[PDB]
């Protein structure tokens, strides 16, 4: 909870990762085959 895609960017700050570096990661997590990410990312994109 509260660790969704809109706020996990703040967590990346503590890991010394800029917002530009996570773009190479965040946009490619769907290609990674993560089960949790796809359910959160695709269902809320248009269906709400």
């Amino acid at each position: 909870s509260q660790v969704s895609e809109h706020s996990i960017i703040k967590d990346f700050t503590k890991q010394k990762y800029p917002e530009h570096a996570i773009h190479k990661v965040l946009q490619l997590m769907l290609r990674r085959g993560e089960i949790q990410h796809r359910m959160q990312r695709k269902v809320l994109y248009r269906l709400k």
Partner: protein, 560 residues
């Protein structure tokens, strides 16, 4: 409007030497400046004065063309220099602090001021040629203190890079409601849908009878007995606060004033009473403060906005006074960011992508809330907290409430409770308010070479107290705060010197920190307070506090 105005312009183009002298101010050096006074044109020709209430909007367009007549005939060269001529219409009497701030009053040139709060300077197609800056409408005053509607200003590529956030400037212009978003093919503009252009930039009597009252020392003693009459407080606490109230070459320094009480006590509200005396007022409220109040969030962006520069409360009170309340409601991450900024009085970015600078000239006043017990455990205060140790020990003075069972205190506060109803029942120091403004703005002392030695002699006397039984456990930084405090004394007594009586009370405030950390047995040293090569470079360091020993007027030593 009419059609006959073109003929009147044609006739009106047919003393003025100042116009010739003023227009030539810009030259090959490329000053890019032109001071414009309205009155000379209106004094010579009264017809121009009549155009103010009828056609002000066209007049600006008309004013630019008529200026070119002098420029085009004499100097075509200015056409290739920025390809623009700046008109700077001067002030236009009237002056309404609250009467003109209305939406019904459009199509009028209006003079007012404001404080810049946030901007988008971090960025490297008609709308793309210009950018956006945020301006406030109600200035700081007891009556004007009510929260206003923020104005949105647009610079017409003219004052860009010349102004910084937190600059108390004067805003002047005409209010046209050019909201282009009604066609629903663009983004949206704020409530004051008005393209407000910036035309001016400001600086970045009973006082004589008041000065008579300054000589009195009877009123000089109650200055710490009159600031907080609600609760009668504690004499030690108010004395230190009063010193910061005055606010009196690598000239750096920090004033870390912290309080340790409880929110139920009106000390939480005591910081609110100060703004009445203060000339600039800052709203804390905790969460949801002014603009970005030390809270960071990310959401889904509107049609068109860019990233926002984080403006700390320090920046929002540039060259003013900034108040911090509700310490536990701050975000942890911002605390680390502003911690260095507070010490360095500026904001430094090491990301190599965004570069900017903001000023910080206010006194940091905040109160902390103790986590659980104060000093119940046998360990240190900093080592029983999940926070990092060194940042906690950055504060110079730690003011905490002393004693909790004071029957005498209960008696006096009890009667005040009844006074609450007395004031509120139906019934058929403002002189001192203007004292502080005059002294801190009109009195600017300079540096005297023969008076630094005598003050510095006593500072060494403080050092030798810890040099008897010990090994250099005291740092000069604690003293470094003391020098500014003795400066405020001269504003108080108007004697230009400092007496040992003032220092002794200042000593107790300094020692108060040691009391909270060290066992109560140190109270015996108060009797003495009443009574009172590698090595070679160390010796010279204390005497002159300069790395070079040959720094005594080297400018005149070598040439002459």
């Amino acid at each position: 409007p009419r059609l006959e105005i073109h003929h009147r312009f044609k006739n009106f183009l047919r003393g003025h030497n100042v116009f010739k002298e003023r227009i030539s101010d810009m030259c090959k050096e490329n000053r890019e400046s032109l001071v414009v006074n309205y009155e000379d044109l209106a004094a010579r020709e009264h017809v121009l004065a009549y155009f103010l209430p009828e056609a002000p909007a066209e007049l600006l367009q008309i004013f630019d063309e008529a200026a070119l007549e002098v420029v085009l005939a004499m100097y075509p060269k200015y056409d290739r220099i920025t390809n623009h001529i700046h008109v700077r219409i001067s002030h236009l009497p009237l002056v309404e602090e609250l009467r003109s701030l209305r939406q019904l009053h459009l199509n009028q040139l209006i003079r007012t001021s404001g404080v810049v709060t946030s901007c988008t300077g971090v960025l490297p197609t008609i709308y793309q040629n210009y950018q956006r800056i945020r301006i406030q409408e109600s200035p700081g005053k007891v009556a004007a203190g009510r929260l206003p509607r923020s104005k949105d200003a647009i610079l017409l590529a003219d004052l860009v890079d010349s102004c910084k956030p937190g600059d108390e400037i004067e805003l002047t212009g005409i209010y046209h409601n050019n909201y282009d978003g009604s066609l629903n093919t663009a983004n949206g503009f704020p409530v004051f849908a008005t393209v407000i252009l910036a035309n001016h930039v400001a600086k970045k009597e009973d006082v004589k009878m008041i000065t008579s009252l300054s000589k009195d020392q009877q009123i000089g003693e109650k200055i710490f007995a009159s600031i907080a009459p609600s609760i009668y407080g504690h004499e030690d606490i108010k004395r230190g606060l009063a010193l910061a109230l005055f606010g009196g070459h690598k000239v750096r320094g920090d004033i870390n004033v912290l309080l340790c009480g409880d929110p139920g006590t009106a000390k939480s509200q005591f910081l609110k009473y100060i703004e009445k005396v203060s000339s600039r007022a800052i709203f804390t409220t905790g969460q949801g403060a002014s603009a970005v109040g030390l809270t960071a969030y990310v959401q889904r962006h509107p049609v068109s906005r860019e990233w926002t520069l984080e403006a700390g409360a320090l920046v929002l009170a540039d060259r003013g006074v900034c108040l911090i309340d509700e310490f536990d409601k701050m975000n942890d991450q911002d605390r680390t960011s502003i911690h260095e900024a507070m010490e360095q009085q500026s904001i430094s970015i090491s990301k190599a992508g965004i570069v900017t600078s903001l000023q910080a000239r206010c006194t940091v006043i905040a109160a902390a809330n103790p986590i659980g017990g104060r000093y119940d455990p046998s360990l240190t205060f900093s080592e029983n907290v999940d926070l990092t140790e060194p940042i906690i020990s950055r504060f110079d003075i730690l003011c905490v409430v002393r004693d909790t069972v004071d029957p005498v205190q209960d008696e006096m506060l009890a009667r005040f409770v009844v006074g609450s109803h007395v004031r509120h029942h139906p019934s058929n120091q403002e002189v001192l308010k203007k004292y502080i403004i005059y002294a801190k703005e009109r009195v600017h002392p300079k540096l005297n070479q023969m008076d630094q030695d005598k003050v510095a002699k006593m500072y060494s006397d403080l050092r030798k107290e810890s040099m008897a039984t010990g090994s250099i456990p005291i740092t000069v930084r604690h003293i470094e705060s003391m020098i500014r405090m003795a400066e405020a004394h001269a504003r108080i007594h108007l004697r230009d010197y400092v007496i040992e009586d003032d220092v002794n009370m200042a000593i107790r405030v300094m020692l108060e920190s040691f009391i909270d950390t060290q066992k109560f047995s140190v109270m015996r040293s108060m009797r003495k307070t009443f009574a009172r090569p590698e090595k070679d470079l160390v010796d010279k360091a204390r005497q002159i506090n300069i790395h070079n020993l040959s720094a005594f007027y080297d400018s005149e030593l070598f040439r002459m």
